[PDB]
Amino acid sequence: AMEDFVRQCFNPMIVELAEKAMKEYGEDPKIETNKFAAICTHLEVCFMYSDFGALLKHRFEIIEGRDRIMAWTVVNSICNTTGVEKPKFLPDLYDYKENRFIEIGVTRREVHIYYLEKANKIKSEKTHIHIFSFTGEEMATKADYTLDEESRARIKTRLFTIRQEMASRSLWDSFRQSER
Numbered sequence: 001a002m003e004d005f006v007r008q009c010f011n012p013m014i015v016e017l018a019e020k021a022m023k024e025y026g027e028d029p030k031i032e033t034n035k036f037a038a039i040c041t042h043l044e045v046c047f048m049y050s051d052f053g054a055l056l057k058h059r060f061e062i063i064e065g066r067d068r069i070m071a072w073t074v075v076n077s078i079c080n081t082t083g084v085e086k087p088k089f090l091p092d093l094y095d096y097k098e099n100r101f102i103e104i105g106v107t108r109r110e111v112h113i114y115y116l117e118k119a120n121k122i123k124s125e126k127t128h129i130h131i132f133s134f135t136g137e138e139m140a141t142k143a144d145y146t147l148d149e150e151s152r153a154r155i156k157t158r159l160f161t162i163r164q165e166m167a168s169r170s171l172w173d174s175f176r177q178s179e180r
């Protein structure tokens with residue numbers, strides 16, 4: 001299915017993680033296959049982002065992909081010893097150079113469309129939003145893209161490749177029309 005492609009095209013850590021997320025909350029990766037793909041994809045971006053970051057070793061902190069006990073434990077740890085307000089939801093990363101949380105968005109829609117939807121869901125938070133499409137289009141609050149272009153090129157390419165792999169297997173049209 002989709003399932004095969006997912007298994008073929010994402011490192012096991014990411015698959016295992018995706019599956020547990022879905023199975024925990026009663027969702028079947030054999031059935032909600034497009035969703036399975038989307039979780040993997042988002043998680044991989046979240047990791048790739050935090051990889052890219054010789055003086056500030058470990059620029060980013062990863063909150064996505066952890067369980068919620070660890071997640072809030074991390075969030076709370078950061079809040080106590082910096083001052084930064086507590087977010088209502090668990091966001092994806094924390095940034096130590098710019099001292100702000102990041103919410104990572106990946107969308108098969110338009111970027112400004114998805115951007116708005118997320119900014120509406122987290123109106124009360126000073127959280128940086130960065131949105132990636134599968135078209136090499138991004139959008140970031142106050143157009144502060146946080147990463148150097150090299151790092152952003154890498155991400156855009158991974159996404160475009162995922163799209164073209166799916167398209168290659170006649171999986172893209174299903175996937176595209178299945179967001180939200």
Ligand SMILES: O=C(O)c1occc(=O)c1O
Pocket residue numbers: 042064090091092104105106
């Ligand atoms: O953390 C989440 O639950 C989450 O859900 C949907 C889209 C995201 O980007 C995200 O971080």
Ligand SMILES: [Mn+2]
Pocket residue numbers: 064090091092
């Ligand atoms: Mn998240």
Ligand SMILES: [Mn+2]
Pocket residue numbers: 042092103104105
């Ligand atoms: Mn996210």
